[PDB]
Design a binder for these strands. Sequence first.
RNA 1: AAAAAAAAAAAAAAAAAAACUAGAUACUAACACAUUUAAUUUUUUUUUGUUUUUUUUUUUUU
Length: 128
Amino acid sequence: NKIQQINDKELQSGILSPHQSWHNEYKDNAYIYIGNLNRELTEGDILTVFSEYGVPVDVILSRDENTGESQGFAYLKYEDQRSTILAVDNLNGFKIGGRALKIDHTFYRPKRSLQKYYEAVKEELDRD
RNA sequence: AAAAAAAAAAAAAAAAAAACUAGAUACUAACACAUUUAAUUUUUUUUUGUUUUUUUUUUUUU
């Protein structure tokens, strides 16, 4: 896990400031990439693990257009962008149901074929 | 500086091991004695990182 190696070397250099961090590049990005998921975990199951580090306002699990089953990666946006640093360097390499997940910062591009999916997601997270 | 004589018993071709097993303690080799710090395989997983885009002949004749 390369992200977990560069946080150890950053922490030993005594950097500890977010603006001197390698995280600083992604200060405008509130989305995260989540990868190497187990196939049984779902959208409401992703919001449960990742709510430890903040309030997730959008979520997208990517799953095939034919068979409708999980490709094994998702996307999640937090209300506060500093929750992104939390999730990235504190939940990375965490074994969940056999496999260790990979979290990275990201720029998310929404698509047209998942449009009404985005309101089937939004009406859950508009409740809270 | 100096100026000999003479009266018939023995002879030898020259203190030590290999082993087992602890033990004395000299030495040898310009031996090696901050580190060497930007090109280059330990880095391994059941493939799985989400927008747009990268073309076609008019008629005819020997």
